[PDB]
Amino acid sequence: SGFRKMAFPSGKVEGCMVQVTCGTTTLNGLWLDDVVYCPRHVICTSEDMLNPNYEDLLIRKSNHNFLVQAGNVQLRVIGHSMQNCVLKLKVDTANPKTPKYKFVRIQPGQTFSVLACYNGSPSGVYQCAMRPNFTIKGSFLNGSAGSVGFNIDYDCVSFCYMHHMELPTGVHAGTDLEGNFYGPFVDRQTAQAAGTDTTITVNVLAWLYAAVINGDRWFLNRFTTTLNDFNLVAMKYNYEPLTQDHVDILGPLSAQTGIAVLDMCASLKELLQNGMNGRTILGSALLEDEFTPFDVVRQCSGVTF
Amino acid sequence: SGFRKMAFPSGKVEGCMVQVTCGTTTLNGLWLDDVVYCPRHVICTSEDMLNPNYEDLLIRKSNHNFLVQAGNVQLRVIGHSMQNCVLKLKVDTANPKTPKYKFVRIQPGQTFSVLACYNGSPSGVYQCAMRPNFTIKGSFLNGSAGSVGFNIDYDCVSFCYMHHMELPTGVHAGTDLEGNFYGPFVDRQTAQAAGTDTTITVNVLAWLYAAVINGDRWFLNRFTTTLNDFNLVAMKYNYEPLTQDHVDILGPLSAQTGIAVLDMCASLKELLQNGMNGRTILGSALLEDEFTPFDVVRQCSGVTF
Amino acid sequence: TSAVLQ
Amino acid sequence: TSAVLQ
């Protein structure tokens, strides 16, 4: 028993991380076969980051200007192109530790592990959700751009995020591995703001199921509810309306615990309206929305990789 | 910006995980050089686990009774011995993935990453603290014994925990890698209970410093307190006493923020007596105690490995 | 309840 | 406020 924010083992991703320097700017790159992928703003100087003309900046850059280091091995850049907001640096060597991998675009509400890196080297691992407003609530400093988010299934690493930048509320924005941002953000130090965020209702219900699995029951055996009455309440508190699809998604947990989804909904309804009254669920005094139903099934069953 | 429960990268540890089967009992082992370390209760049947005499039980075993699988390759056991509550199985092949490593015994209030494993395969990684009562609040199912906790320093893995058992309140107990239990617990399915726990004061302060470093300052005030007065409040709220060694350990954080430790202590005293008035600190409605001062420095400085 | 060996 | 490229 017990329930923790649990990240995927990072070993397969650690072997792909490299350092990319251009001028005075250093960040991380992702080394897969003979290509290193990295944020394009590695070509900026500190005077270029307000209104960067990336096309013109890349023109005045040649291959030898990209210093790429894998551990204590220098890679040779033999070609460069810019794709959306990433650079693709062709190197003279294939990464022998390249794992089986996919590039995917994740949906808001889904979660992933982040391997936070500096100087091409792993610093730590933690779990994030893609918020509805397309930011993530990460832990990133200067030099972390190029760190990636991923999921693992068997032996296949699905990369879904590459980090680029921090917004003024201290949240983070980045791209998929094609270099296309999540959300209406651009890689420039212009005035930008995250949009209003909502709470991931289906994840909160999954975590409540996790808590029941682990013997927390004080919030249960509420008078039941219907879907519409639940959504009337949910939207008052900035929760995403619940759909039959979301109800369908929660079946496996509902069946496992023997608590009907709409009964959990009624427990959540009461929690929204009355709070927890100083009490805690799985060590938290706030409703947690960064565990998906799969995250719960995966941790409470013991799926391995 | 941002502050997350961040685990160490796990790749160096992943390559040390193996599976150990003895009869119908399976759990995990740690393969370093030509030795596999694992909890000794792998030799138990289910009827053995009430009041085992492990000396007798081990005498009754031979090398051929231990099936050790490193993925798909079976490692042949050529020697066995017991050290307190761990088994040391000598194998005929040294792990070619053995990292630079140390065995350390950690103190209550220190943290570490857990690589949770089943059948010698990693399922996920997460960060734990050794509670003052010598338990840990982990996420462990049956089959997870022999999972290890660790810290990394430079390129050296410091293994500090091996998981053995779950206590009835759902918390976890284990040994160092020399097989000595943390706390007054024994590896037998008898009636055992964790002592009353307390909150790790120096860690709450470290985390309050993290909050300030990340722009959360609403809880600060103009007051200072003495160490003695603060500890009279600490004792009332079941917090560990703050020592002058703890004040010194907070030195990097007081330096970075300009907030003296006894000035932060006046904030903490006010939070304890008054609560948070519906506000949050670093996304939490509770005072968090599982970050050490070094954990804050590591994350907010970008220390890598 | 008793301890549970995992 | 301005975004920060990291």
Side-chain angles (χ1 to χ4, degrees), chain A residues 1-46 48-59 61-71 73-89 91-99 101 103-152 155-221 223-231 233-235 237-244 246-269 271-305, chain B residues 1-46 48-99 101-305, chain C, chain D:
Chain A
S1 74
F3 199 78
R4 281 266 189 201
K5 291 277 173 73
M6 205 175 64
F8 292 104
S10 64
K12 296 182 181 323
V13 178
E14 291 170 53
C16 311
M17 295 319 296
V18 306
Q19 172 194 105
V20 187
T21 301
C22 182
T24 206
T25 301
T26 174
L27 44 72
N28 309 283
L30 184 71
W31 184 24
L32 301 164
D33 304 322
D34 63 341
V35 178
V36 175
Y37 303 82
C38 75
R40 68 178 173 165
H41 71 257
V42 70
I43 75 192
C44 294
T45 78
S46 316
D48 299 307
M49 303 179 148
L50 194 271
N51 255 11
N53 180 348
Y54 284 105
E55 278 80 9
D56 195 80
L57 285 170
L58 203 48
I59 281 161
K61 309 311 244 204
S62 58
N63 288 349
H64 84 269
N65 285 127
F66 296 105
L67 308 73
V68 180
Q69 193 90 9
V73 188
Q74 212 175 282
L75 316 172
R76 200 169 317 130
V77 184
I78 63 185
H80 53 297
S81 39
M82 165 177 74
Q83 173 191 119
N84 300 313
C85 302
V86 296
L87 253 52
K88 274 170 53 144
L89 315 169
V91 285
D92 66 297
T93 300
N95 183 4
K97 275 166 189 243
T98 304
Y101 75 90
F103 290 174
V104 293
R105 197 169 173 94
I106 64 111
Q107 306 304 316
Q110 305 187 294
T111 57
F112 53 88
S113 301
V114 170
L115 181 66
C117 295
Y118 299 89
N119 310 306
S121 291
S123 167
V125 57
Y126 54 82
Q127 198 77 353
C128 283
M130 182 66 52
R131 304 302 316 169
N133 71 356
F134 289 105
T135 67
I136 68 171
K137 281 175 197 179
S139 179
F140 291 116
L141 310 158
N142 192 30
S144 63
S147 306
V148 302
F150 63 98
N151 279 273
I152 311 205
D155 54 359
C156 187
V157 183
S158 278
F159 297 107
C160 60
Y161 179 84
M162 158 168 291
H163 182 55
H164 286 246
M165 50 189 217
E166 180 174 300
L167 291 173
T169 48
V171 298
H172 300 104
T175 68
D176 54 26
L177 267 297
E178 317 285 341
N180 290 316
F181 264 91
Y182 288 102
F185 312 114
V186 290
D187 51 353
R188 317 146 66 148
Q189 312 213 127
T190 44
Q192 302 179 63
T196 47
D197 204 20
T198 58
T199 303
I200 313 156
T201 309
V202 61
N203 287 5
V204 178
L205 291 164
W207 173 72
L208 290 171
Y209 277 111
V212 169
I213 297 186
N214 284 286
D216 285 3
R217 252 147 199 283
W218 66 259
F219 52 86
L220 274 186
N221 302 288
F223 200 94
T224 196
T225 188
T226 66
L227 219 34
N228 305 343
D229 302 349
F230 175 82
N231 290 330
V233 179
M235 315 184 45
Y237 294 92
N238 217 357
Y239 271 58
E240 307 199 301
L242 206 64
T243 68
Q244 185 58 46
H246 292 118
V247 176
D248 295 344
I249 303 276
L250 292 148
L253 289 172
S254 183
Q256 166 168 2
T257 54
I259 297 158
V261 171
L262 275 169
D263 283 340
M264 212 51 89
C265 283
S267 299
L268 176 49
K269 204 214 298 213
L271 285 168
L272 293 160
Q273 302 175 291
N274 313 319
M276 280 152 93
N277 306 109
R279 305 174 279 192
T280 70
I281 297 174
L282 290 178
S284 180
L286 294 180
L287 299 173
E288 172 64 61
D289 82 333
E290 297 217 344
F291 294 99
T292 71
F294 190 5
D295 295 343
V296 176
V297 166
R298 179 233 307 160
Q299 193 178 146
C300 289
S301 88
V303 182
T304 62
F305 310 86
Chain B
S1 290
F3 204 68
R4 277 265 200 211
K5 284 292 191 13
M6 171 174 319
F8 287 102
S10 63
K12 295 159 110 93
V13 178
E14 287 169 53
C16 309
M17 282 345 273
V18 306
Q19 171 186 253
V20 181
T21 304
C22 184
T24 62
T25 297
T26 307
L27 42 72
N28 304 280
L30 186 73
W31 182 21
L32 301 164
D33 296 318
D34 62 342
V35 175
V36 171
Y37 305 78
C38 73
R40 67 182 176 172
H41 73 255
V42 70
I43 71 189
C44 289
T45 63
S46 309
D48 275 333
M49 284 174 177
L50 205 52
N51 176 254
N53 187 279
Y54 285 100
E55 208 181 353
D56 285 353
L57 291 166
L58 189 56
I59 277 158
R60 288 161 196 164
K61 292 290 185 248
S62 321
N63 288 337
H64 78 263
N65 293 122
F66 297 98
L67 165 55
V68 182
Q69 285 159 276
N72 56 310
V73 53
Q74 155 171 31
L75 315 173
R76 176 175 85 91
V77 179
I78 70 198
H80 62 278
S81 60
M82 176 165 66
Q83 181 174 15
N84 301 309
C85 300
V86 297
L87 282 197
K88 302 204 280 212
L89 317 170
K90 191 206 262 273
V91 289
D92 65 21
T93 171
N95 186 3
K97 309 206 190 123
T98 302
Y101 76 94
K102 291 181 189 173
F103 289 170
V104 295
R105 186 165 174 91
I106 55 146
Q107 302 181 250
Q110 294 291 323
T111 53
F112 54 88
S113 302
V114 168
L115 181 68
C117 291
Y118 298 96
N119 305 123
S121 290
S123 97
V125 60
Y126 54 82
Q127 195 69 0
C128 299
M130 181 56 75
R131 305 300 315 171
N133 70 357
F134 291 105
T135 65
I136 86 167
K137 310 174 164 163
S139 178
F140 291 116
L141 313 156
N142 260 73
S144 66
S147 302
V148 298
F150 65 97
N151 283 273
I152 302 180
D153 184 37
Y154 286 82
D155 57 345
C156 178
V157 181
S158 281
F159 297 103
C160 59
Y161 179 79
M162 175 162 274
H163 181 53
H164 289 244
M165 49 202 213
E166 178 169 300
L167 293 176
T169 51
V171 299
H172 296 109
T175 64
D176 56 29
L177 266 300
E178 294 195 334
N180 315 281
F181 258 89
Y182 286 105
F185 311 109
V186 293
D187 44 353
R188 50 194 65 241
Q189 308 199 145
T190 62
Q192 300 181 67
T196 301
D197 200 26
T198 52
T199 305
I200 311 160
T201 309
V202 62
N203 287 8
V204 173
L205 290 167
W207 174 75
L208 288 175
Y209 277 110
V212 171
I213 290 168
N214 280 271
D216 297 342
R217 299 177 72 97
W218 65 258
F219 53 85
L220 296 182
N221 69 25
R222 61 185 201 281
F223 302 120
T224 204
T225 180
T226 65
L227 184 61
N228 281 359
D229 287 350
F230 172 79
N231 278 326
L232 290 163
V233 174
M235 176 160 48
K236 281 183 42 167
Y237 287 89
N238 200 29
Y239 270 52
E240 292 283 278
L242 199 63
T243 75
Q244 185 72 30
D245 284 11
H246 296 144
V247 179
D248 293 344
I249 285 326
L250 295 158
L253 302 180
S254 61
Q256 167 81 9
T257 60
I259 297 168
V261 170
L262 294 180
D263 185 359
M264 198 58 95
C265 285
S267 299
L268 179 54
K269 167 184 325 196
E270 173 168 54
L271 286 167
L272 293 163
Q273 318 181 132
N274 298 350
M276 293 196 188
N277 298 359
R279 304 177 272 200
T280 60
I281 300 178
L282 284 176
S284 174
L286 296 168
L287 303 173
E288 172 65 46
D289 81 333
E290 306 216 336
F291 296 101
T292 70
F294 183 51
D295 290 337
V296 177
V297 170
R298 158 198 176 209
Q299 192 168 158
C300 296
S301 292
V303 169
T304 62
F305 313 90
Chain C
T1 299
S2 288
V4 173
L5 303 182
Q6 299 184 293
Chain D
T1 299
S2 286
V4 176
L5 297 176
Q6 293 182 305

